[PDB]
Amino acid sequence: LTQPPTITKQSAKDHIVDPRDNILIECEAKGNPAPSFHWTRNSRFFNIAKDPRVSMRRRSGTLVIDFRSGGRPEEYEGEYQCFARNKFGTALSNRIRLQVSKSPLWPKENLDPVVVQEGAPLTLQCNPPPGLPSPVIFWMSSSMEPITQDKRVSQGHNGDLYFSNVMLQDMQTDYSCNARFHFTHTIQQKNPFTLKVLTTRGVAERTPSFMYPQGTASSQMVLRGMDLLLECIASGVPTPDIAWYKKGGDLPSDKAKFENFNKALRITNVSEEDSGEYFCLASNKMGSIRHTISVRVKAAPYWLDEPKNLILAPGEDGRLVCRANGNPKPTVQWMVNGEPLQSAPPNPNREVAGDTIIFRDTQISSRAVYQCNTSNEHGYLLANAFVSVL
Amino acid sequence: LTQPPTITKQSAKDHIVDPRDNILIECEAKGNPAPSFHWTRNSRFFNIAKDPRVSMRRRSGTLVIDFRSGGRPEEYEGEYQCFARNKFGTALSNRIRLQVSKSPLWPKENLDPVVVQEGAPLTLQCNPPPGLPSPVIFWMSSSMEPITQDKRVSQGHNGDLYFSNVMLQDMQTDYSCNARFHFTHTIQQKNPFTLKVLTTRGVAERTPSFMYPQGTASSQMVLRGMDLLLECIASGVPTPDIAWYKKGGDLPSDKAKFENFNKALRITNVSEEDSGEYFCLASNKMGSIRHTISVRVKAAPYWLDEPKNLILAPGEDGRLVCRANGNPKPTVQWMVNGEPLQSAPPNPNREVAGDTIIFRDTQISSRAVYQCNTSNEHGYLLANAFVSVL
Numbered sequence A, B: 001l002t003q004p005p006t007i008t009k010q011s012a013k014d015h016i017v018d019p020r021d022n023i024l025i026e027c028e029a030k031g032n033p034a035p036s037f038h039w040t041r042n043s044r045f046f047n048i049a050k051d052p053r054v055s056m057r058r059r060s061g062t063l064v065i066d067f068r069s070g071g072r073p074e075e076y077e078g079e080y081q082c083f084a085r086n087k088f089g090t091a092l093s094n095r096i097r098l099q100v101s102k103s104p105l106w107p108k109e110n111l112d113p114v115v116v117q118e119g120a121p122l123t124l125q126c127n128p129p130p131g132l133p134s135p136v137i138f139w140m141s142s143s144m145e146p147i148t149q150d151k152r153v154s155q156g157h158n159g160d161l162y163f164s165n166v167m168l169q170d171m172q173t174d175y176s177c178n179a180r181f182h183f184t185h186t187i188q189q190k191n192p193f194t195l196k197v198l199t200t201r202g203v204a205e206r207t208p209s210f211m212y213p214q215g216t217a218s219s220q221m222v223l224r225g226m227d228l229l230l231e232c233i234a235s236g237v238p239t240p241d242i243a244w245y246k247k248g249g250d251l252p253s254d255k256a257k258f259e260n261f262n263k264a265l266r267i268t269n270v271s272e273e274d275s276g277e278y279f280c281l282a283s284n285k286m287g288s289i290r291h292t293i294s295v296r297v298k299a300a301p302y303w304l305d306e307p308k309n310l311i312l313a314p315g316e317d318g319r320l321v322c323r324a325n326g327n328p329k330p331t332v333q334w335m336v337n338g339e340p341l342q343s344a345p346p347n348p349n350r351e352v353a354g355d356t357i358i359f360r361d362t363q364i365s366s367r368a369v370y371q372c373n374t375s376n377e378h379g380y381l382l383a384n385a386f387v388s389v390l
Ligand SMILES: *[C@@H]1O[C@H](CO)[C@@H](O)[C@H](O)[C@H]1NC(C)=O
Pocket: A093, A094, A095, A373, A374, A375, A380, A382
């Protein structure tokens, strides 16, 4: 029966949508008395009433927009936050950054016909327009024939097409960069590149070079839990081979997978242990060079000690611990029903110790719905926890 | 020196544009005194001044819109007409129907898994969203592999995929209809069809049937000068062959081309002679049926006798003949400087005889810029011709 508000469901922290079926910023909550809801858009009170498009729901705060009457979601991009309040206190949802799933066109460009000496290297740079999330990329002939890839010719993760050495058959098709988008499935085509190779009467066998990762070394930061992608594209006449190593250690055979005609190396659920120096070798015939990649592993906050609701008997000492591990180390900010602790109705029964709160002689009053934001450069965590007396 | 206005350049009758680089409704003209320009949008005076987007040009009437400040071309679709006026008279441009090059998305649909008995026929209907002009269509696996076509499996001009008889290998891929648009090059994908064929232990050899052109006969109207496309898709176990004929005549070996694994027949620059009854045969092993297509050839107007400008000596009888051949036969409407003849400043020296005007005792006055609209159901022609006295 007598329990303060608690968020039941909510739209994702990163709520992305296509201009198709109208938006649904979700927010639901429990509570003894059915909670009332209000919203903020970019930190200012979001006035539902003066907006024709948006409307609230059956016994909930879930919103619904409607563009069936001359409207565009491109103006409706921003940070949303739901507030669930009842007689006891108020609980908050995450900060919903609603963004439109763009599948934009390529800038109009009259491309130069590509002329390169035979056997020499070439990089057909794609450079796609943004779009969210990143579009899957592939190369096709302008007449929709799939371009076959091998150790000699392959694409990098950025979408660029890499020719180790340009042969004569590379004129058996033209080359157009395609970008397939995730949820709209729209594909955008960039103008076809026409290759005009020049025969210079020479197999001139050359030492290998580094095409994509420029020069000698490179650094990479990567988030705990995400994937780590290492690449090495080489330009050599006798088509170069790539090989991989980690300095003073073995590459984890389970988490690691050679991709792209050995040109790339993925490590899946990366952790601190996966940081350090990795290197690759472009093992030609006339030589063998090396690239060194430095991998540092930073981390978005993840819960060590998430605060839970507190049901205490009058007079009992209670405590809330909000601790997350991250890199850089997370910060803790406390809130009482949305209002920042600093400017909250004073309470003598409360002692604050950074990430730890302690409630001595919990009494009749003092029933509220505390918040915890633990954050760092790379992310945050928001916990709701109430302090009800029995 | 002393010559009335004459249109030099103008945007195409069907001026289609992508929301990309801002619109350019062109209109230029000659004339002794440099002509002044104004426009109509959907038959009412188009007020440039109260519109921020549009602007006129250096010594011309060519317009230019600009959406760099919160605007959409979808509201700017309509019929435009340029008016070039000088001290003597006024000449008009064609009615420019400006339309936006749409490459719209497919309606959201959860498709049914396709289950069909082996050897039996099936039609994977594409049914694409409009877009202008019509999108080029093809079928691909959801992972971008091209679906190979043959006499057994091929697509109709409407985009539907036709299985004469469904084999077992037809499960070696899924099937998604793709629509590539002409000038934007955007491709839209419809959800993949998953085929689950059922082996029923039977090669049961069957009589052929007509898949696309339904039943026995079909009619087709086609415009003079355009292409004529005839199709016949058959459903038979021993994969049917298609053959073509014209009743009481030979198919023109020069203008005709067998396409689509013989399943279609194109005749290029069609004229009246190309009308009549064509038929095809689905020549199976167990039988051979026939479809009859009736082709009638109608025609948009084309000039027989286009009116030219008139330079006459005072007192000389002149004449304007405006005659176009079409089917249905064209209509003639005359205008004096945009104003319809019926409500024009009366002139005794002018005798009208349908498509023919005659100016007796051409005098000092009477210098104007007459118009001719010859039209029928399928199109029109607009000629400007002035009547200057020497
Ligand atoms: C938590 O704090 C960080 C940094 O102050 C901020 O960017 C983030 O939006 C906050 N989250 C919430 C829901 O308060």
